[PDB]
Amino acid sequence: GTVGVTQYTDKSAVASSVDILNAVAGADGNKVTTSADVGFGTPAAAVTYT
Amino acid sequence: DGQTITIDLKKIDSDTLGLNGFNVNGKGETANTAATLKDMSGFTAAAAPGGTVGVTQYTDKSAVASSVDILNAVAGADGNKVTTSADVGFGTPAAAVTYT
Amino acid sequence: ADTAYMSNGVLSDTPPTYYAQADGSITTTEDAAAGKLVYKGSDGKLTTD
């Protein structure tokens, strides 16, 4: 509510897919839910693998 | 390592030595400086009536005029209206107020 | 969803937020009492050291 201050944001920091994969692999014990995987899950009969 | 001698160097030029143009003769028109936001230490106002958060209104108070200033201002224009009581001579008893 | 943002070295749901003070200074939070006024130099990215 202080009008004496003004907010600036640095956009264009959009996460890339490789960055998200690196982030999830960085920590141990995370959760990934994906469908339409190569080999296993190619028919994509089920979605929730985790 | 660490056993050195230090030589002090100062920026020596027209500006640092002062006087920024000696200008003995005068009659020379000179440009002004910029806004210099740092100097504007007057009364701060977070009003911003336009709603723009990127602007902050600064007002410079202590510009209140004196009584003689008000009298000079009203006398400068021709045809003004001044309502007063407790005048010297006429109106000293001040039976009436609105003379104008 | 545009809800994943590159921080300095980690992945965060929020983009880097910067606040510009009345006196021209830059700080991360509204109150100047906190914030650890932002710095820059020799590497860019406005790192806070």
What is the element layout, followed by pairings?
This is part of a larger assembly, with 3 copies of chain A.
Chain A: E1 6-9, H1 17-26
Can you describe what's shown?
The PDB classes it as structural protein. The structure is cut from a larger assembly and holds three copies of chain A. By secondary structure, the first copy, chain A, is of the alpha+beta class. Chain A is built from one helix and one strand. Chain A is elongated and about 60 Å long. The termini of chain A are far apart. Chains A and C meet through strand 1 and helix 1 of A and strand 1 and strand 3 of C.
Condensed summary:
Chain A is α+β, with helices and mostly antiparallel strands.
Number of strands of chain A: 1
Q: Hey, which two chains have the biggest interface? A: A-C, 15 and 16 residues
Describe the main β-sheet of chain A briefly.
Answer: none
In N-to-C order, the SSE pattern of chain A is: EH
Give the overall silhouette of chain A. elongated
Total count of helical runs of at least 4 residues of chain A: 1
What percentage of the residues of chain A does DSSP assign to strands (E)?
5-15%
Radius of gyration of chain A: 19 Å
Determine the N-to-C terminus distance of chain A: 43 Å
Chain oligomer state: part of a larger assembly
Q: Which structural class fits the helix and strand makeup of chain A?
A: alpha+beta
PDB class: structural protein
Keywords: Bacteria flagellar filament, motility, flagellar polymorphism, structural protein
Entry title: Cryo-EM structure of the enteropathogenic E. coli O127:H6 flagellar filament
Chains A, B, C: Flagellin
